[PDB]
Amino acid sequence: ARPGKTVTGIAATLEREGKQVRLGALLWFDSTSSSVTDMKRLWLFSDNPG
Amino acid sequence: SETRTLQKIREATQELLKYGLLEEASKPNLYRIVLSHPEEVTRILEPLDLDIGIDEIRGLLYVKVRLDETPAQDEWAHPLVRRQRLNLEQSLLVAILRQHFVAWEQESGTGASQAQIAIDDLLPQLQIYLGDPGSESKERTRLLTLLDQLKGHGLVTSPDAHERIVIRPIIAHLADPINLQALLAWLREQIAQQT
Amino acid sequence: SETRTLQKIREATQELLKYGLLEEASKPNLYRIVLSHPEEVTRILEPLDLDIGIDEIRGLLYVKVRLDETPAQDEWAHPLVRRQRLNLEQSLLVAILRQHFVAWEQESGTGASQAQIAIDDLLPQLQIYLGDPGSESKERTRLLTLLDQLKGHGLVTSPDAHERIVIRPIIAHLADPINLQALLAWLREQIAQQT
DNA sequence: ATATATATATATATATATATATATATATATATATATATAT
DNA sequence: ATATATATATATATATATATATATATATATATATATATAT
């Protein structure tokens, strides 16, 4: 369903007593090439509700 | 057992291969020597599947591939020749230089007077599309870096005492500028839209 | 009609030129093409003031600067060679690598290519001469900087996962005992400079 | 002694196996530009 | 504060590996002819 240029993301939302803390990632492709390097990466880590 | 290749032919062929392109106005002796021994030069180069192209109207000699005609690699690739694909700004400046070289060759002859343009003239042409980078120093740095990179490509000379470069004849010898024409049409369309 | 050389010969010579050396163990077809027309390779490099080096005991072919009617003076000034000149530290590490190569050769013979040593094996061998940078990572950086260049000359492979390298047979000729004695004399001249 | 019946041999055809050439995918090396860090 | 070196990003070009298709060579099957052994 997503062979060409595509973008994918995930984000879990842990917390305690209202203190949000979010672990999220983003993975995307530029072309139909499916090398391990073709998938460009970036993690996230934040505790800001924004 | 058998004779060697003549010294001057060897030296001139190696010189051209090192430089790719050369001028009679620059080294007329090698120019005449090669043009007096084109068979020897091509025989030296054909084992490499290379050869030379010349332009006596503009007084320039340059190399050229001589592989077997039109294999599946129409977008050709050669062992001894690593090819390049220039970027947005590089090819943009190349198109600017192409258009002004075309104009010069009409208003100043087909290389009779070496094609020239001032830094303060090229910079406005770039500014048409890229706009003001932020300062005159930044403009000059941008254009001079690009011009140096193209000079490494054998396309332009360094600015003279009056900040005027000289366009090498090789610009007239590009393969498929139709891509440059399409790019320039796209650029003018974009700027007309984005103004 | 035309002096076009045979396509296979052009292929083999173009590859040899592209990498400057050719081993039968790796590319037997081109190696045997070269040794089938070695005089052709010579007569083609002769126009370029270059010559073909041959060592069949190790199944190796490499290109070397020819003597013109002037023996290339300082041959490193030859126009075509792309690389720089060898320097002291490079020669030191070359000598150590040749020492290990000759040890492995006495152990298993000359023609094979299985010799190896590890990054940590090299590190003391040079650290004795070069002093201690102050951290293991810094001396590893030193060694890898040397190894990158030496690979650029074809002496060694790239650092492997085991942090080792494979000695290339061509080192048998860069570390020629005659050339080693000449370099020893040059080192004595360097002593005179120190004097 | 000769006739005939049967076995054996040969030639050709076609089916199959294997070798090689080529097309395509993937991985790496170059490679060049730019941004940032660090040294003076 | 400036200059230099380094690391990373873009990115592209080359090399290597693997799979499939084609061509060729071999072998086996079938049919016919000839030789030979047996019977009358």
XYZ file of C-alpha atoms (C1' of nucleotides) in Angstrom:
520
model
C 0.000 0.000 0.000
C 2.957 2.374 0.462
C 5.655 1.386 -2.061
C 6.644 4.859 -3.295
C 7.765 7.918 -1.384
C 6.039 7.665 1.979
C 6.160 8.828 5.588
C 5.332 6.817 8.708
C 5.226 7.719 12.383
C 4.507 6.394 15.860
C 4.156 7.985 19.285
C 3.369 6.451 22.675
C 2.233 8.662 25.561
C 3.468 7.599 28.985
C 2.701 9.712 32.049
C 2.298 9.869 35.815
C -0.012 12.153 37.791
C -0.540 14.385 34.758
C 3.153 14.576 33.791
C 3.083 13.759 30.090
C 6.170 12.148 28.597
C 6.082 11.161 24.936
C 8.281 8.722 23.014
C 7.829 9.090 19.266
C 9.600 8.209 16.047
C 9.371 9.063 12.353
C 10.384 6.862 9.414
C 10.055 7.783 5.740
C 11.239 6.887 2.241
C 12.188 9.033 -0.743
C 11.897 6.436 -3.524
C 10.955 2.848 -4.286
C 14.490 1.890 -3.236
C 14.164 -0.203 -0.073
C 17.698 -0.170 1.302
C 18.251 -0.086 5.047
C 19.759 3.354 4.415
C 16.819 4.469 2.255
C 14.706 4.714 5.426
C 15.719 8.023 6.986
C 15.182 8.173 10.718
C 14.531 10.468 13.645
C 13.455 9.745 17.217
C 11.661 12.107 19.573
C 11.591 12.497 23.341
C 9.600 15.259 25.002
C 7.604 16.096 28.117
C 5.884 19.187 26.707
C 2.153 18.880 25.880
C 2.691 20.841 22.654
C 62.900 -3.741 -32.022
C 60.677 -0.898 -33.219
C 60.414 2.868 -32.960
C 58.819 4.918 -30.196
C 56.020 7.448 -30.493
C 57.193 10.970 -31.280
C 57.885 13.046 -28.180
C 55.773 16.106 -28.968
C 52.695 14.070 -29.926
C 52.909 12.187 -26.624
C 53.379 15.381 -24.622
C 50.506 17.220 -26.313
C 48.109 14.277 -26.007
C 48.903 13.893 -22.310
C 48.498 17.651 -21.834
C 45.051 17.649 -23.437
C 43.966 14.606 -21.427
C 45.090 16.357 -18.241
C 43.197 19.519 -19.225
C 40.419 18.005 -21.345
C 40.243 21.178 -23.433
C 42.864 23.679 -24.573
C 43.181 26.792 -26.733
C 45.456 27.857 -29.565
C 45.459 31.325 -27.999
C 46.748 29.586 -24.848
C 49.210 27.004 -26.244
C 49.324 27.487 -30.029
C 52.337 25.199 -30.484
C 50.627 22.131 -29.012
C 47.461 23.116 -30.884
C 49.249 23.067 -34.241
C 51.228 19.932 -33.362
C 48.074 17.975 -32.528
C 46.183 19.273 -35.559
C 49.159 18.181 -37.685
C 49.016 14.685 -36.147
C 45.293 14.007 -35.585
C 45.652 10.417 -36.802
C 48.444 9.776 -34.301
C 46.501 11.408 -31.462
C 43.307 9.450 -32.128
C 45.320 6.237 -32.492
C 46.784 7.043 -29.070
C 43.303 7.675 -27.661
C 41.147 5.065 -29.408
C 42.533 2.202 -27.242
C 41.031 4.192 -24.372
C 37.889 4.540 -26.534
C 38.564 8.285 -26.380
C 39.113 10.892 -29.088
C 39.306 14.668 -29.563
C 36.853 17.279 -30.741
C 38.069 20.553 -32.220
C 36.649 23.985 -33.076
C 38.944 26.005 -35.334
C 36.350 28.790 -35.566
C 36.762 29.407 -31.828
C 40.275 27.932 -31.734
C 39.599 25.193 -29.167
C 40.528 21.518 -28.926
C 38.849 19.088 -26.547
C 38.457 15.388 -25.813
C 35.577 13.149 -26.870
C 34.583 9.542 -26.232
C 34.912 7.087 -29.126
C 33.196 3.960 -27.837
C 31.253 1.709 -30.176
C 28.255 3.595 -31.500
C 25.082 3.825 -29.398
C 25.077 0.836 -27.032
C 22.255 0.412 -24.546
C 24.079 3.085 -22.521
C 22.675 6.012 -24.494
C 23.076 7.838 -21.187
C 26.634 6.721 -21.700
C 29.059 5.485 -19.063
C 32.774 4.920 -19.642
C 35.330 3.239 -17.339
C 37.958 6.011 -17.414
C 35.298 8.750 -17.249
C 33.302 9.373 -14.078
C 30.230 11.400 -14.989
C 28.606 14.181 -12.968
C 25.094 15.546 -12.393
C 25.138 19.193 -11.338
C 22.742 20.722 -8.828
C 19.977 23.312 -9.087
C 22.202 26.371 -8.657
C 25.119 25.029 -10.703
C 22.949 24.308 -13.738
C 21.083 27.578 -13.151
C 24.328 29.525 -13.489
C 25.246 27.359 -16.479
C 21.989 28.348 -18.190
C 22.637 32.021 -17.408
C 26.104 31.735 -18.934
C 24.677 29.885 -21.941
C 22.128 32.601 -22.687
C 24.625 35.441 -22.365
C 27.206 33.516 -24.411
C 24.582 33.063 -27.125
C 23.950 36.810 -27.075
C 27.678 37.615 -27.145
C 28.387 35.342 -30.107
C 25.896 37.424 -32.104
C 26.882 40.884 -30.853
C 30.613 40.052 -30.701
C 31.197 37.122 -33.078
C 31.417 33.341 -32.752
C 34.520 33.427 -30.587
C 36.166 36.157 -32.663
C 36.133 38.139 -29.423
C 36.233 35.757 -26.473
C 32.860 35.820 -24.742
C 32.958 38.049 -21.667
C 30.625 39.278 -18.939
C 31.058 41.267 -15.746
C 30.413 39.979 -12.236
C 27.996 42.880 -11.730
C 26.149 41.653 -14.842
C 25.896 37.956 -13.949
C 24.815 38.763 -10.388
C 21.568 40.500 -11.483
C 20.678 37.509 -13.671
C 20.996 35.166 -10.692
C 19.166 37.679 -8.482
C 16.225 37.453 -10.895
C 15.491 33.956 -9.571
C 17.388 33.573 -6.279
C 16.865 37.154 -5.095
C 19.190 39.093 -2.838
C 21.147 36.621 -0.647
C 21.583 39.276 2.051
C 24.587 41.381 1.068
C 26.809 42.315 -1.852
C 29.646 40.357 -0.246
C 27.387 37.296 -0.089
C 26.399 37.794 -3.738
C 30.032 37.969 -4.830
C 30.973 34.962 -2.690
C 28.120 32.900 -4.148
C 28.857 33.792 -7.763
C 32.623 33.431 -7.345
C 32.332 30.000 -5.723
C 30.023 28.875 -8.524
C 32.348 30.343 -11.161
C 35.346 28.598 -9.597
C 33.472 25.288 -9.602
C 32.589 25.774 -13.276
C 36.206 26.737 -13.986
C 37.178 23.384 -12.517
C 34.681 22.133 -15.096
C 36.593 24.057 -17.775
C 33.661 26.331 -18.624
C 34.719 29.830 -17.496
C 37.790 31.881 -16.638
C 38.478 33.905 -13.515
C 37.341 37.550 -13.556
C 39.812 40.028 -15.008
C 40.982 43.243 -13.341
C 37.530 44.647 -14.207
C 35.716 41.596 -12.769
C 34.961 40.327 -16.293
C 35.193 36.587 -16.912
C 35.837 34.943 -20.282
C 33.524 32.172 -21.470
C 35.420 29.161 -22.768
C 34.299 27.895 -26.205
C 33.407 24.533 -24.631
C 30.061 26.022 -23.580
C 29.072 25.865 -27.253
C 30.085 22.177 -27.195
C 27.615 20.874 -24.597
C 25.659 17.788 -25.609
C 21.944 18.366 -24.892
C 21.225 21.939 -23.739
C 17.538 21.312 -24.523
C 17.442 20.413 -20.837
C 18.984 23.825 -20.137
C 16.319 25.477 -22.299
C 13.531 23.643 -20.468
C 15.107 24.547 -17.121
C 15.368 28.218 -18.065
C 11.757 28.255 -19.261
C 10.748 26.686 -15.941
C 12.819 29.224 -13.994
C 11.385 32.236 -15.815
C 7.878 30.815 -15.376
C 8.492 30.288 -11.657
C 9.857 33.791 -11.073
C 7.026 35.327 -13.093
C 4.589 33.373 -10.915
C 6.471 34.077 -7.675
C 6.474 37.880 -8.029
C 40.895 0.762 -42.080
C 40.804 2.546 -38.729
C 43.427 1.768 -36.088
C 40.744 0.647 -33.622
C 42.257 -1.782 -31.134
C 40.389 -4.992 -30.369
C 37.538 -4.487 -27.922
C 38.788 -6.981 -25.326
C 42.225 -5.338 -25.329
C 40.565 -1.953 -24.813
C 38.510 -3.380 -21.940
C 41.525 -4.865 -20.169
C 43.743 -1.806 -20.617
C 40.951 0.554 -19.541
C 40.397 -1.448 -16.350
C 44.131 -1.605 -15.623
C 44.351 2.162 -16.111
C 41.275 2.755 -13.950
C 42.807 0.915 -10.992
C 46.495 0.903 -11.961
C 46.959 -2.784 -11.139
C 45.426 -6.107 -12.120
C 45.690 -9.484 -10.377
C 44.960 -12.770 -12.133
C 43.517 -14.214 -8.921
C 40.847 -11.487 -8.955
C 40.223 -10.793 -12.669
C 41.877 -13.635 -14.601
C 40.262 -12.775 -17.945
C 41.660 -9.240 -18.148
C 45.005 -10.382 -16.723
C 45.349 -13.013 -19.449
C 44.212 -10.469 -22.042
C 47.037 -8.191 -20.889
C 49.620 -10.982 -20.917
C 48.367 -12.012 -24.371
C 49.183 -8.563 -25.794
C 51.673 -7.177 -23.248
C 53.571 -5.501 -26.081
C 50.307 -3.806 -27.078
C 49.922 -2.542 -23.509
C 53.518 -1.309 -23.610
C 53.075 0.432 -26.978
C 49.889 2.085 -25.690
C 51.415 3.223 -22.395
C 54.522 4.363 -24.289
C 52.522 7.231 -25.866
C 51.627 8.198 -22.288
C 55.238 7.794 -21.078
C 54.039 4.900 -18.906
C 55.035 1.243 -18.734
C 53.529 -2.085 -17.692
C 54.956 -3.886 -14.676
C 54.563 -7.662 -14.590
C 55.021 -10.221 -11.795
C 53.595 -13.613 -12.744
C 54.830 -15.320 -9.565
C 52.112 -13.368 -7.742
C 49.870 -13.156 -10.820
C 50.013 -9.359 -10.766
C 50.037 -6.562 -13.344
C 50.667 -2.919 -12.468
C 51.428 0.304 -14.327
C 54.625 2.274 -13.734
C 56.036 5.543 -15.032
C 58.116 5.035 -18.159
C 61.432 6.602 -19.012
C 61.097 9.167 -21.776
C 64.246 10.321 -23.538
C 64.355 12.172 -20.217
C 63.738 9.536 -17.494
C 60.680 11.509 -16.315
C 63.067 13.529 -14.116
C 61.261 13.212 -10.788
C 58.725 10.810 -12.264
C 56.096 11.876 -9.723
C 55.799 15.065 -11.801
C 54.297 12.936 -14.579
C 51.099 14.731 -15.678
C 48.754 11.726 -15.622
C 49.274 10.302 -12.117
C 46.433 11.579 -9.946
C 47.911 10.896 -6.507
C 50.494 12.696 -4.391
C 53.996 11.511 -3.545
C 54.878 9.038 -0.813
C 56.186 10.455 2.464
C 58.124 9.294 5.509
C 55.422 7.849 7.782
C 53.915 6.046 4.796
C 57.313 4.495 4.060
C 57.712 3.461 7.712
C 54.383 1.647 7.772
C 55.143 0.191 4.332
C 58.387 -1.234 5.705
C 56.605 -2.812 8.670
C 53.906 -4.256 6.402
C 56.585 -5.659 4.092
C 58.309 -7.198 7.116
C 55.103 -9.014 8.018
C 54.595 -9.925 4.351
C 58.045 -11.508 4.066
C 57.496 -13.366 7.338
C 54.195 -14.723 6.022
C 55.911 -15.547 2.726
C 58.615 -17.606 4.415
C 55.718 -19.244 6.257
C 53.499 -20.019 3.242
C 55.221 -18.801 0.067
C 55.093 -15.733 -2.148
C 52.233 -16.165 -4.625
C 49.357 -16.395 -2.150
C 47.418 -13.497 -0.616
C 46.183 -14.647 2.819
C 48.499 -12.456 4.924
C 46.855 -10.255 7.559
C 47.399 -8.368 10.806
C 45.064 -6.511 13.132
C 44.730 -2.841 14.040
C 46.088 -3.592 17.512
C 48.961 -5.517 15.910
C 49.911 -2.466 13.840
C 49.429 0.032 16.647
C 52.561 -0.829 18.700
C 54.663 -1.278 15.557
C 54.163 2.405 14.714
C 53.642 3.674 18.274
C 57.279 2.755 18.919
C 58.301 5.408 16.377
C 55.490 7.956 16.539
C 55.228 8.443 20.305
C 51.977 8.189 22.209
C 49.151 10.590 21.253
C 47.578 10.154 24.700
C 44.557 7.979 23.884
C 43.981 4.693 22.086
C 41.330 6.228 19.828
C 43.802 8.880 18.655
C 46.435 6.323 17.640
C 43.702 4.292 15.937
C 42.759 7.455 14.036
C 46.421 7.860 13.071
C 46.639 4.273 11.820
C 43.358 4.506 9.909
C 44.452 7.780 8.309
C 47.605 6.052 7.082
C 45.680 2.961 5.965
C 43.125 4.951 3.971
C 45.892 6.516 1.891
C 47.856 3.281 1.519
C 44.669 1.637 0.252
C 44.396 4.605 -2.097
C 47.728 3.394 -3.479
C 46.514 -0.218 -3.578
C 48.910 -1.534 -0.925
C 46.257 -2.743 1.542
C 42.565 -3.547 1.761
C 40.110 -1.510 3.806
C 39.862 -2.148 7.561
C 37.650 -5.190 8.050
C 35.174 -6.016 10.805
C 37.981 -7.776 12.699
C 40.060 -4.566 12.501
C 42.577 -6.295 10.223
C 43.920 -5.719 6.706
C 45.097 -7.959 3.865
C 48.488 -7.253 2.305
C 48.339 -6.798 -1.454
C 51.089 -8.566 -3.450
C 52.088 -5.325 -5.227
C 53.929 -4.361 -2.036
C 56.634 -6.794 -3.162
C 57.738 -4.170 -5.709
C 57.195 -0.894 -3.851
C 59.430 -2.454 -1.185
C 62.050 -3.492 -3.715
C 65.355 -4.244 -1.928
C 67.118 -2.034 -4.482
C 64.572 0.690 -3.768
C 64.959 -0.012 -0.047
C 68.711 0.585 -0.325
C 68.081 3.765 -2.311
C 65.654 4.922 0.385
C 68.284 4.053 2.996
C 70.736 6.326 1.185
C 68.053 9.021 1.040
C 67.528 8.560 4.785
C 71.261 9.063 5.273
C 70.845 12.300 3.320
C 68.036 13.198 5.726
C 70.507 12.530 8.550
C 72.930 14.928 6.873
C 70.061 17.425 6.851
C 69.591 16.759 10.572
C 73.358 17.208 10.929
C 21.726 -76.267 -50.600
C 18.372 -72.774 -50.295
C 14.671 -70.177 -48.049
C 13.026 -67.707 -44.358
C 12.754 -66.034 -39.861
C 14.881 -63.411 -36.265
C 18.422 -60.718 -34.031
C 21.508 -57.148 -34.417
C 23.225 -52.795 -36.207
C 22.776 -48.153 -37.932
C 20.814 -43.736 -39.106
C 17.853 -40.051 -37.946
C 14.807 -37.470 -35.210
C 13.463 -35.296 -31.188
C 13.499 -34.723 -26.436
C 16.180 -33.283 -22.500
C 20.117 -31.418 -19.739
C 23.531 -28.274 -19.200
C 26.167 -24.237 -20.097
C 26.366 -19.407 -20.942
C 24.764 -14.748 -21.727
C 22.129 -11.018 -20.160
C 19.028 -8.465 -17.374
C 18.060 -6.619 -12.962
C 18.655 -5.623 -7.899
C 21.579 -4.365 -4.237
C 25.440 -2.781 -1.876
C 29.406 0.297 -1.467
C 32.688 3.761 -2.744
C 33.388 8.162 -4.263
C 32.470 12.663 -3.943
C 31.430 16.880 -3.340
C 29.078 20.655 -0.585
C 27.742 22.521 3.627
C 27.368 23.160 8.557
C 29.422 23.094 12.916
C 33.193 22.704 16.323
C 37.626 23.943 17.798
C 42.041 26.109 17.658
C 44.747 30.473 17.420
C 36.529 36.670 15.941
C 38.188 34.190 12.180
C 39.963 30.202 9.784
C 40.472 25.571 9.335
C 39.187 20.656 9.802
C 35.873 17.369 10.291
C 31.492 15.067 9.932
C 27.290 14.378 7.606
C 23.933 14.649 3.789
C 22.904 14.160 -0.793
C 23.678 11.365 -4.348
C 25.148 9.323 -7.798
C 27.935 5.965 -10.258
C 30.090 1.621 -10.340
C 30.577 -3.349 -9.286
C 28.865 -7.821 -8.002
C 25.540 -11.398 -7.538
C 21.739 -14.040 -8.833
C 18.037 -15.708 -11.703
C 16.060 -16.865 -16.099
C 16.044 -17.615 -20.855
C 18.183 -19.501 -24.944
C 21.227 -22.491 -27.645
C 23.642 -26.265 -28.149
C 25.032 -30.992 -27.507
C 24.060 -35.604 -26.205
C 21.218 -39.669 -25.909
C 17.691 -42.489 -26.410
C 13.814 -44.376 -29.338
C 12.128 -46.236 -33.609
C 12.406 -48.022 -37.860
C 14.618 -50.483 -41.601
C 18.215 -53.430 -43.631
C 21.441 -57.025 -43.374
C 23.517 -61.091 -41.611
C 23.188 -65.460 -39.862
C 21.310 -69.558 -38.067
C 17.997 -73.099 -38.530
C 14.769 -76.051 -41.132
C 13.243 -78.366 -45.029
